[PDB]
């Protein structure tokens, strides 16, 4: 039986750590809500 | 507590207290990913949050009212993931989304890896609006994780 706990405000952070790339991927989405990669 | 913000979704049903996911309280509605709660009711202090809307294929669910989150990635600008990892303080992480191309259109995706239990963490634009939720995605050749920017409809 699940419960929630507040963790913060939703706000943009002016000087945040910046990371991650920007892949462009062909995907499929099935009826179960699962993504898969196409080639 | 109904105040807007980001929340952890916890359970005591396992060893200790376990974070199963994250979600967004906005305009009195709690928003998370379907796979976090499987649509079950939630406790908020003494209160009960009942499910209101959900869809397994979109992998989204709202509580206490209809889905409220409208904003969409602009397709051009960096965004921030407000990651709330288990046992760890909320942290903003800025990134330029990539794209999931599907038969039914393109959606943004963020190439950021966080532990199980971070699903539902919100992705924000520079205005602070939630443009979707993190935690439904793919595992790529590199073995890393790429999450869709999953947004509902208001």
XYZ file of N, CA, C and O in Angstrom:
772
model
N 0.851 -1.185 0.000
C 0.000 0.000 0.000
C 0.899 1.251 0.000
O 1.641 1.527 0.948
N 0.805 2.001 -1.087
C 1.771 3.035 -1.436
C 1.361 4.387 -0.866
O 0.173 4.672 -0.692
N 2.361 5.234 -0.598
C 2.141 6.558 -0.034
C 3.120 7.523 -0.677
O 4.147 7.115 -1.213
N 2.797 8.811 -0.621
C 3.640 9.822 -1.252
C 4.227 10.778 -0.217
O 3.663 11.025 0.852
N 5.392 11.327 -0.568
C 6.166 12.212 0.305
C 6.708 13.344 -0.546
O 7.315 13.093 -1.595
N 6.507 14.584 -0.111
C 6.954 15.706 -0.930
C 8.471 15.726 -0.986
O 9.135 15.486 0.024
N 9.011 15.996 -2.178
C 10.450 16.028 -2.412
C 10.975 17.364 -2.917
O 12.197 17.594 -2.846
N 10.122 18.265 -3.381
C 10.615 19.576 -3.774
C 9.613 20.347 -4.600
O 8.515 19.867 -4.918
N 9.994 21.595 -4.876
C 9.324 22.447 -5.845
C 9.766 22.057 -7.244
O 10.863 21.529 -7.444
N 8.910 22.338 -8.216
C 9.207 22.116 -9.621
C 9.660 23.453 -10.195
O 8.847 24.341 -10.463
N 10.970 23.599 -10.367
C 11.528 24.851 -10.847
C 12.766 24.576 -11.681
O 13.507 23.621 -11.432
N 12.970 25.422 -12.675
C 14.207 25.399 -13.442
C 15.359 25.881 -12.565
O 15.205 26.810 -11.771
N 16.510 25.219 -12.670
C 17.685 25.576 -11.880
C 18.683 26.304 -12.778
O 19.165 25.740 -13.763
N 19.031 27.537 -12.406
C 19.715 28.426 -13.341
C 21.053 27.862 -13.801
O 21.409 27.985 -14.980
N 21.822 27.259 -12.894
C 23.156 26.787 -13.262
C 23.296 25.284 -13.048
O 24.230 24.832 -12.378
N 22.393 24.499 -13.636
C 22.375 23.066 -13.395
C 23.497 22.346 -14.138
O 24.001 22.813 -15.165
N 23.890 21.197 -13.590
C 24.773 20.282 -14.295
C 24.136 19.920 -15.627
O 22.948 19.603 -15.681
N 24.916 20.006 -16.702
C 24.419 19.848 -18.068
C 25.076 18.620 -18.676
O 26.304 18.567 -18.793
N 24.265 17.648 -19.106
C 24.848 16.387 -19.545
C 23.849 15.649 -20.419
O 22.705 16.078 -20.587
N 24.278 14.505 -20.929
C 23.408 13.715 -21.795
C 23.570 14.102 -23.249
O 23.906 15.238 -23.587
N 23.412 13.111 -24.120
C 23.426 13.338 -25.552
C 21.982 13.382 -26.057
O 21.033 13.432 -25.263
N 21.816 13.367 -27.386
C 20.540 13.675 -28.040
C 20.291 12.685 -29.162
O 20.169 13.055 -30.336
N 20.199 11.402 -28.828
C 20.023 10.378 -29.867
C 18.681 10.500 -30.576
O 17.654 10.800 -29.961
N 18.697 10.244 -31.877
C 17.496 10.191 -32.700
C 17.288 8.725 -33.062
O 18.085 8.145 -33.806
N 16.218 8.134 -32.538
C 16.028 6.692 -32.536
C 14.679 6.343 -33.147
O 13.668 6.974 -32.824
N 14.666 5.346 -34.026
C 13.411 4.787 -34.517
C 12.898 3.784 -33.491
O 13.602 2.827 -33.145
N 11.686 4.012 -32.979
C 11.126 3.152 -31.949
C 9.707 2.770 -32.345
O 9.083 3.389 -33.211
N 9.228 1.709 -31.706
C 7.849 1.260 -31.779
C 7.284 1.218 -30.370
O 8.005 0.969 -29.407
N 5.984 1.443 -30.240
C 5.327 1.429 -28.944
C 4.216 0.402 -29.038
O 3.342 0.531 -29.898
N 4.264 -0.616 -28.177
C 3.267 -1.676 -28.262
C 2.094 -1.405 -27.319
O 2.052 -0.419 -26.570
N 1.095 -2.289 -27.398
C -0.148 -2.075 -26.669
C 0.060 -2.111 -25.157
O -0.732 -1.519 -24.417
N 1.133 -2.751 -24.684
C 1.479 -2.806 -23.267
C 2.255 -1.576 -22.795
O 2.666 -1.521 -21.628
N 2.435 -0.584 -23.655
C 3.154 0.615 -23.246
C 4.647 0.440 -23.237
O 5.348 1.237 -22.602
N 5.160 -0.571 -23.913
C 6.598 -0.820 -23.957
C 7.177 -0.339 -25.275
O 6.681 -0.681 -26.355
N 8.271 0.404 -25.182
C 9.016 0.841 -26.349
C 10.014 -0.230 -26.771
O 10.585 -0.941 -25.943
N 10.237 -0.330 -28.075
C 11.304 -1.175 -28.584
C 12.017 -0.428 -29.700
O 11.473 0.503 -30.303
N 13.255 -0.835 -29.948
C 14.070 -0.239 -30.994
C 13.836 -0.944 -32.319
O 13.805 -2.176 -32.390
N 13.682 -0.153 -33.369
C 13.583 -0.663 -34.729
C 14.957 -0.503 -35.367
O 15.403 0.621 -35.623
N 15.633 -1.622 -35.616
C 16.998 -1.611 -36.145
C 17.871 -0.581 -35.419
O 18.985 -0.883 -34.972
N -1.278 16.336 2.270
C -0.679 17.500 1.618
C -0.999 17.506 0.128
O -0.729 16.539 -0.585
N -1.568 18.609 -0.339
C -1.903 18.768 -1.743
C -1.023 19.795 -2.437
O -1.216 20.049 -3.627
N -0.040 20.374 -1.749
C 0.675 21.491 -2.350
C 1.409 21.023 -3.604
O 1.960 19.920 -3.646
N 1.383 21.860 -4.642
C 2.120 21.563 -5.858
C 3.545 21.144 -5.517
O 4.146 21.635 -4.555
N 4.089 20.248 -6.321
C 5.497 19.921 -6.272
C 5.742 18.516 -6.768
O 4.852 17.854 -7.309
N 6.975 18.069 -6.574
C 7.369 16.713 -6.933
C 7.380 15.873 -5.667
O 7.733 16.368 -4.584
N 6.909 14.620 -5.795
C 6.740 13.695 -4.676
C 7.359 12.340 -4.968
O 7.300 11.849 -6.094
N 7.897 11.707 -3.921
C 8.248 10.293 -3.979
C 7.016 9.404 -3.773
O 6.168 9.697 -2.936
N 6.957 8.285 -4.503
C 5.989 7.220 -4.280
C 6.706 6.071 -3.571
O 7.636 5.470 -4.122
N 6.270 5.774 -2.354
C 6.940 4.859 -1.443
C 6.031 3.673 -1.134
O 4.808 3.772 -1.208
N 6.643 2.564 -0.728
C 5.903 1.470 -0.117
C 6.701 0.884 1.040
O 7.935 0.908 1.039
N 5.980 0.362 2.037
C 6.580 -0.410 3.120
C 6.390 -1.913 2.938
O 6.772 -2.684 3.826
N 5.795 -2.342 1.820
C 5.459 -3.745 1.615
C 6.684 -4.620 1.424
O 6.560 -5.847 1.502
N 7.843 -4.034 1.162
C 9.071 -4.784 0.971
C 10.008 -4.529 2.145
O 9.614 -3.986 3.183
N 11.255 -4.938 1.983
C 12.258 -4.644 2.989
C 12.347 -3.137 3.192
O 12.545 -2.387 2.232
N 12.160 -2.692 4.434
C 12.272 -1.282 4.771
C 11.263 -0.439 4.007
O 10.168 -0.894 3.646
N 11.634 0.818 3.766
C 10.844 1.737 2.950
C 11.486 1.819 1.577
O 12.662 2.164 1.463
N 10.713 1.523 0.537
C 11.232 1.406 -0.811
C 10.546 2.428 -1.700
O 9.311 2.523 -1.717
N 11.340 3.187 -2.432
C 10.791 4.132 -3.391
C 10.513 3.387 -4.675
O 11.423 2.811 -5.286
N 9.245 3.368 -5.060
C 8.833 2.695 -6.279
C 8.742 3.669 -7.446
O 8.756 3.225 -8.606
N 8.678 4.968 -7.180
C 8.592 5.938 -8.248
C 8.475 7.345 -7.712
O 8.766 7.615 -6.545
N 8.048 8.243 -8.603
C 7.982 9.676 -8.381
C 6.741 10.192 -9.102
O 6.251 9.568 -10.044
N 6.248 11.354 -8.678
C 5.193 12.013 -9.417
C 5.030 13.479 -9.106
O 5.763 14.073 -8.309
N 4.073 14.075 -9.802
C 3.898 15.525 -9.850
C 2.496 15.858 -9.339
O 1.496 15.403 -9.904
N 2.430 16.693 -8.323
C 1.188 17.274 -7.832
C 1.037 18.659 -8.459
O 1.919 19.527 -8.324
N -0.072 18.854 -9.179
C -0.327 20.140 -9.812
C -1.825 20.325 -9.914
O -2.544 19.415 -10.365
N -2.296 21.499 -9.503
C -3.728 21.816 -9.533
C -4.576 20.741 -8.845
O -5.689 20.427 -9.280
N -4.050 20.188 -7.743
C -4.729 19.224 -6.896
C -4.817 17.814 -7.443
O -5.519 16.982 -6.854
N -4.101 17.522 -8.521
C -4.072 16.235 -9.181
C -2.662 15.683 -9.096
O -1.689 16.422 -9.281
N -2.546 14.405 -8.764
C -1.264 13.739 -8.711
C -1.068 12.945 -9.988
O -1.944 12.174 -10.391
N 0.087 13.148 -10.608
C 0.434 12.612 -11.909
C 1.639 11.700 -11.757
O 2.691 12.162 -11.305
N 1.541 10.463 -12.250
C 2.723 9.594 -12.285
C 2.602 8.668 -13.484
O 1.716 8.817 -14.337
N 3.543 7.747 -13.598
C 3.510 6.789 -14.686
C 2.722 5.552 -14.242
O 2.793 5.120 -13.081
N 1.917 5.012 -15.159
C 1.084 3.868 -14.797
C 1.889 2.749 -14.170
O 1.464 2.153 -13.171
N 3.072 2.448 -14.723
C 3.820 1.293 -14.256
C 4.350 1.460 -12.832
O 4.735 0.470 -12.205
N 4.338 2.672 -12.291
C 4.748 2.885 -10.911
C 3.723 2.317 -9.938
O 4.087 1.627 -8.972
N 2.441 2.651 -10.142
C 1.373 2.299 -9.212
C 0.470 1.194 -9.721
O -0.306 0.641 -8.933
N 0.544 0.866 -11.003
C -0.414 -0.027 -11.651
C -1.860 0.408 -11.407
O -2.788 -0.415 -11.436
N -2.068 1.698 -11.172
C -3.405 2.225 -10.977
C -3.959 2.099 -9.581
O -5.123 2.450 -9.364
N -3.165 1.634 -8.622
C -3.667 1.445 -7.278
C -3.843 2.775 -6.548
O -3.201 3.777 -6.846
N -4.661 2.728 -5.494
C -4.859 3.922 -4.686
C -3.576 4.270 -3.929
O -2.716 3.421 -3.685
N -3.460 5.547 -3.566
C -2.313 6.074 -2.838
C -2.760 6.726 -1.536
O -3.885 7.218 -1.412
N -1.863 6.708 -0.564
C -2.029 7.406 0.699
C -1.206 8.690 0.656
O -0.075 8.697 0.156
N -1.787 9.782 1.152
C -1.065 11.040 1.363
C -1.329 11.484 2.805
O -2.271 12.231 3.078
N -0.498 11.034 3.726
C -0.783 11.308 5.127
C -1.990 10.502 5.559
O -2.043 9.284 5.366
N -2.979 11.181 6.137
C -4.218 10.519 6.524
C -5.169 10.343 5.352
O -6.161 9.621 5.486
N -4.879 10.969 4.207
C -5.801 10.969 3.096
C -5.568 9.841 2.109
O -4.497 9.238 2.030
N -6.620 9.552 1.355
C -6.584 8.580 0.274
C -6.652 9.330 -1.046
O -7.499 10.209 -1.217
N -5.737 9.013 -1.960
C -5.807 9.500 -3.330
C -6.357 8.383 -4.208
O -5.698 7.353 -4.391
N -7.537 8.595 -4.768
C -8.048 7.554 -5.646
C -7.659 7.820 -7.096
O -7.638 8.968 -7.545
N -7.406 6.770 -7.863
C -7.137 6.948 -9.290
C -8.336 7.554 -9.987
O -9.489 7.316 -9.607
N -8.045 8.361 -10.995
C -9.067 9.067 -11.760
C -9.028 8.751 -13.243
O -10.086 8.532 -13.872
N -7.834 8.705 -13.828
C -7.672 8.428 -15.248
C -6.374 7.675 -15.427
O -5.388 7.988 -14.763
N -6.350 6.749 -16.371
C -5.060 6.171 -16.711
C -5.112 5.424 -18.016
O -6.184 5.129 -18.546
N -3.913 5.124 -18.523
C -3.815 4.416 -19.794
C -2.479 3.706 -19.852
O -1.419 4.353 -19.785
N -2.531 2.381 -19.977
C -1.314 1.572 -19.945
C -0.420 1.887 -21.128
O 0.808 1.816 -21.024
N -1.009 2.158 -22.290
C -0.174 2.345 -23.467
C 0.580 3.657 -23.385
O 1.770 3.723 -23.725
N -0.098 4.712 -22.940
C 0.606 5.964 -22.662
C 1.522 5.863 -21.437
O 2.437 6.709 -21.265
N 1.268 4.871 -20.571
C 1.970 4.638 -19.310
C 1.853 5.831 -18.365
O 2.823 6.244 -17.729
N 0.630 6.362 -18.243
C 0.318 7.496 -17.396
C -0.929 7.221 -16.573
O -1.794 6.428 -16.969
N -1.023 7.927 -15.452
C -2.143 7.824 -14.516
C -2.229 9.115 -13.732
O -1.204 9.737 -13.397
N -3.469 9.556 -13.498
C -3.726 10.690 -12.630
C -4.637 10.300 -11.483
O -5.470 9.371 -11.584
N -4.498 11.061 -10.409
C -5.231 10.880 -9.167
C -5.942 12.178 -8.810
O -5.361 13.272 -8.899
N -7.193 12.041 -8.357
C -8.045 13.073 -7.789
C -8.633 13.984 -8.860
O -9.418 14.870 -8.517
N -8.263 13.821 -10.118
C -8.779 14.646 -11.168
C -8.117 14.300 -12.467
O -7.223 13.454 -12.530
N -8.548 14.945 -13.543
C -7.981 14.650 -14.855
C -6.569 15.182 -14.998
O -6.154 16.106 -14.298
N -5.853 14.575 -15.932
C -4.488 14.992 -16.245
C -4.447 16.487 -16.543
O -5.193 16.982 -17.394
N -3.524 17.207 -15.866
C -3.450 18.666 -15.913
C -2.246 19.191 -16.693
O -2.195 20.394 -16.983
N -1.280 18.340 -17.012
C 0.015 18.789 -17.532
C -0.075 18.873 -19.054
O -0.301 17.853 -19.720
N 0.086 20.100 -19.578
C -0.157 20.516 -20.959
C 1.101 20.756 -21.775
O 1.063 20.702 -23.010
N 2.174 21.127 -21.122
C 3.296 21.718 -21.830
C 4.008 20.662 -22.663
O 4.001 19.472 -22.340
N 4.635 21.113 -23.745
C 5.322 20.214 -24.656
C 6.716 20.745 -24.941
O 6.941 21.962 -24.996
N 7.650 19.816 -25.135
C 8.986 20.187 -25.588
C 8.870 20.995 -26.873
O 7.988 20.745 -27.696
N 9.751 21.994 -27.023
C 9.717 22.842 -28.209
C 10.469 22.236 -29.385
O 10.403 22.782 -30.490
N 11.148 21.114 -29.190
C 11.880 20.487 -30.262
C 13.233 21.111 -30.531
O 13.960 20.616 -31.401
N 13.595 22.164 -29.800
C 14.813 22.937 -30.031
C 15.668 23.146 -28.789
O 16.901 23.125 -28.894
N 15.057 23.393 -27.628
C 15.765 23.879 -26.452
C 16.112 22.763 -25.477
O 15.449 21.723 -25.407
N 17.138 23.017 -24.679
C 17.442 22.110 -23.587
C 16.318 22.147 -22.556
O 15.530 23.095 -22.464
N 16.245 21.070 -21.789
C 15.240 20.887 -20.766
C 15.969 20.474 -19.501
O 17.163 20.200 -19.516
N 15.228 20.360 -18.409
C 15.803 19.825 -17.189
C 14.976 18.654 -16.724
O 13.751 18.764 -16.631
N 15.654 17.549 -16.442
C 15.069 16.477 -15.645
C 15.212 16.811 -14.168
O 16.329 17.032 -13.683
N 14.103 16.855 -13.448
C 14.148 16.996 -11.995
C 14.127 15.583 -11.424
O 13.077 15.019 -11.063
N 15.321 15.006 -11.351
C 15.486 13.629 -10.923
C 15.320 13.548 -9.414
O 15.919 14.324 -8.667
N 14.539 12.570 -8.972
C 14.343 12.311 -7.548
C 14.713 10.853 -7.293
O 13.829 9.988 -7.224
N 15.996 10.530 -7.165
C 16.412 9.130 -7.058
C 16.173 8.616 -5.651
O 16.086 9.416 -4.711
N 16.041 7.304 -5.467
C 15.734 6.793 -4.126
C 16.814 7.176 -3.128
O 18.014 7.057 -3.400
N 16.371 7.667 -1.970
C 17.268 8.019 -0.890
C 18.144 9.234 -1.129
O 19.036 9.502 -0.318
N 17.924 9.966 -2.222
C 18.806 11.042 -2.658
C 17.986 12.296 -2.919
O 16.832 12.233 -3.332
N 18.599 13.446 -2.652
C 17.917 14.728 -2.786
C 17.543 14.987 -4.238
O 18.241 14.567 -5.165
N 16.399 15.651 -4.448
C 16.013 16.029 -5.801
C 17.137 16.847 -6.432
O 17.759 17.687 -5.774
N 17.376 16.615 -7.725
C 18.475 17.282 -8.423
C 18.042 17.601 -9.847
O 17.455 16.753 -10.524
N 18.310 18.826 -10.289
C 18.074 19.200 -11.680
C 19.258 18.820 -12.553
O 20.427 19.088 -12.213
N 18.947 18.261 -13.714
C 19.952 17.854 -14.678
C 19.486 18.334 -16.045
O 18.421 17.954 -16.515
N 20.296 19.180 -16.673
C 19.921 19.858 -17.904
C 20.443 19.048 -19.080
O 21.530 18.472 -19.006
N 19.646 18.960 -20.145
C 20.050 18.143 -21.279
C 19.312 18.606 -22.524
O 18.291 19.289 -22.445
N 19.899 18.312 -23.687
C 19.198 18.554 -24.932
C 18.541 17.248 -25.333
O 19.265 16.267 -25.604
N 17.214 17.180 -25.395
C 16.572 15.917 -25.753
C 16.925 15.479 -27.163
O 17.145 16.293 -28.063
N 16.978 14.163 -27.342
C 16.892 13.554 -28.651
C 15.440 13.294 -28.974
O 14.531 13.935 -28.443
N 15.220 12.354 -29.887
C 13.897 12.137 -30.457
C 13.652 10.647 -30.601
O 14.502 9.917 -31.115
N 12.478 10.198 -30.161
C 11.933 8.912 -30.562
C 11.097 9.147 -31.816
O 10.125 9.904 -31.771
N 11.463 8.515 -32.919
C 10.665 8.553 -34.136
C 9.817 7.285 -34.184
O 10.358 6.173 -34.153
N 8.503 7.455 -34.232
C 7.572 6.336 -34.297
C 6.690 6.465 -35.527
O 6.657 7.502 -36.197
N 5.938 5.393 -35.803
C 5.015 5.409 -36.932
C 3.972 6.508 -36.779
O 3.419 6.979 -37.781
N 3.696 6.925 -35.547
C 2.646 7.886 -35.252
C 3.192 9.244 -34.828
O 2.454 10.055 -34.264
N 4.462 9.508 -35.082
C 5.025 10.814 -34.835
C 6.235 10.734 -33.944
O 6.605 9.682 -33.432
N 6.857 11.886 -33.765
C 8.074 11.989 -32.984
C 7.755 12.555 -31.614
O 6.883 13.418 -31.480
N 8.479 12.080 -30.599
C 8.409 12.664 -29.271
C 9.831 12.845 -28.769
O 10.748 12.124 -29.179
N 10.001 13.794 -27.860
C 11.308 14.007 -27.262
C 11.758 12.818 -26.433
O 10.956 12.027 -25.936
N 13.075 12.683 -26.291
C 13.637 11.658 -25.422
C 14.861 12.210 -24.721
O 15.608 13.007 -25.291
N 15.090 11.755 -23.490
C 16.234 12.214 -22.709
C 17.149 11.038 -22.382
O 16.688 10.010 -21.867
N 18.457 11.214 -22.660
C 19.472 10.171 -22.486
C 20.178 10.369 -21.144
O 21.332 10.816 -21.046
N 19.474 9.977 -20.097
C 19.896 10.099 -18.718
C 19.532 8.814 -17.984
O 18.419 8.297 -18.139
N 20.473 8.309 -17.181
C 20.341 7.018 -16.509
C 20.236 7.235 -15.006
O 21.152 7.788 -14.394
N 19.149 6.768 -14.414
C 18.943 6.845 -12.977
C 18.418 5.522 -12.474
O 17.877 4.715 -13.249
N 18.530 5.259 -11.171
C 18.116 3.967 -10.623
C 16.631 3.690 -10.798
O 15.804 4.592 -10.935
N 16.298 2.399 -10.803
C 14.923 1.992 -10.596
C 14.370 2.746 -9.398
O 15.032 2.866 -8.360
N 13.177 3.292 -9.564
C 12.536 4.094 -8.550
C 12.513 5.565 -8.876
O 11.829 6.335 -8.182
N 13.224 5.978 -9.913
C 13.175 7.359 -10.367
C 12.040 7.590 -11.379
O 11.746 8.745 -11.706
N 11.391 6.532 -11.878
C 10.295 6.698 -12.837
C 9.254 7.683 -12.314
O 8.839 7.611 -11.159
N 8.777 8.568 -13.193
C 7.819 9.598 -12.836
C 8.432 10.953 -12.546
O 7.696 11.930 -12.317
N 9.745 11.042 -12.532
C 10.368 12.325 -12.287
C 10.045 13.278 -13.437
O 10.048 12.869 -14.600
N 9.723 14.532 -13.146
C 9.269 15.439 -14.193
C 10.407 16.032 -14.995
O 11.500 16.244 -14.474
N 10.104 16.287 -16.260
C 10.980 16.996 -17.188
C 10.376 18.375 -17.403
O 9.164 18.509 -17.575
N 11.206 19.414 -17.305
C 10.711 20.777 -17.305
C 11.309 21.581 -18.445
O 12.451 21.343 -18.865
N 10.557 22.584 -18.888
C 11.105 23.583 -19.785
C 11.648 24.774 -18.989
O 11.605 24.819 -17.755
N 12.208 25.752 -19.709
C 12.857 26.878 -19.050
C 11.877 27.718 -18.248
O 12.307 28.475 -17.364
N 10.580 27.605 -18.537
C 9.535 28.272 -17.774
C 9.120 27.492 -16.541
O 8.217 27.928 -15.822
N 9.732 26.341 -16.295
C 9.366 25.518 -15.171
C 8.127 24.666 -15.366
O 7.699 24.024 -14.410
N 7.532 24.651 -16.553
C 6.369 23.795 -16.790
C 6.795 22.360 -17.049
O 7.828 22.104 -17.674
N 5.962 21.418 -16.607
C 6.261 20.005 -16.796
C 5.859 19.623 -18.209
O 4.677 19.663 -18.553
N 6.845 19.246 -19.025
C 6.583 18.822 -20.393
C 6.498 17.314 -20.543
O 6.242 16.846 -21.661
N 6.721 16.549 -19.479
C 6.420 15.128 -19.436
C 7.140 14.478 -18.268
O 7.796 15.143 -17.449
N 7.009 13.158 -18.200
C 7.553 12.351 -17.114
C 8.591 11.371 -17.647
O 8.463 10.836 -18.754
N 9.626 11.157 -16.841
C 10.765 10.307 -17.139
C 10.535 8.896 -16.614
O 10.093 8.721 -15.481
N 10.893 7.895 -17.422
C 10.957 6.539 -16.912
C 10.299 5.470 -17.768
O 10.210 4.322 -17.324
N 9.837 5.811 -18.971
C 9.463 4.809 -19.970
C 10.342 5.010 -21.200
O 10.258 6.052 -21.860
N 11.175 4.032 -21.520
C 12.095 4.174 -22.636
C 12.722 2.885 -23.127
O 12.112 1.828 -23.073
N 13.970 3.001 -23.618
C 14.642 1.894 -24.277
C 16.052 1.771 -23.736
O 16.595 2.698 -23.124
N 16.639 0.601 -23.974
C 18.051 0.333 -23.721
C 18.727 0.191 -25.077
O 18.276 -0.590 -25.924
N 19.792 0.958 -25.294
C 20.385 1.071 -26.624
C 21.583 0.140 -26.755
O 21.907 -0.596 -25.818
N 22.228 0.147 -27.930
C 23.413 -0.683 -28.140
C 24.458 -0.412 -27.067
O 24.975 -1.340 -26.434
N 24.747 0.870 -26.822
C 25.684 1.296 -25.789
C 25.343 0.728 -24.416
O 26.124 0.885 -23.471
N 24.182 0.082 -24.287
C 23.729 -0.435 -23.015
C 23.107 0.593 -22.100
O 22.545 0.215 -21.060
N 23.177 1.877 -22.455
C 22.608 2.948 -21.655
C 21.094 3.030 -21.854
O 20.500 2.322 -22.674
N 20.483 3.939 -21.102
C 19.043 4.121 -21.052
C 18.651 5.433 -21.715
O 19.289 6.458 -21.507
N 17.589 5.400 -22.513
C 17.018 6.613 -23.082
C 15.523 6.608 -22.772
O 14.807 5.667 -23.152
N 15.047 7.655 -22.092
C 13.638 7.757 -21.701
C 12.838 8.622 -22.669
O 13.271 9.698 -23.063
N 11.643 8.178 -23.018
C 10.706 9.096 -23.652
C 10.404 10.264 -22.724
O 10.437 10.130 -21.497
N 10.101 11.419 -23.316
C 9.415 12.501 -22.596
C 7.915 12.209 -22.717
O 7.254 12.568 -23.701
N 7.364 11.545 -21.712
C 5.977 11.050 -21.813
C 5.024 12.098 -21.268
O 5.066 12.435 -20.077
N 4.162 12.618 -22.134
C 3.186 13.622 -21.749
C 1.778 13.147 -22.075
O 1.568 12.442 -23.062
N 0.838 13.559 -21.252
C -0.560 13.229 -21.430
C -1.286 14.283 -22.233
O -0.682 15.122 -22.905
N -2.612 14.229 -22.165
C -3.501 15.170 -22.834
C -4.417 15.786 -21.785
O -4.992 15.059 -20.968
N -4.545 17.114 -21.803
C -5.520 17.818 -20.963
C -6.761 18.218 -21.768
O -7.816 17.585 -21.665
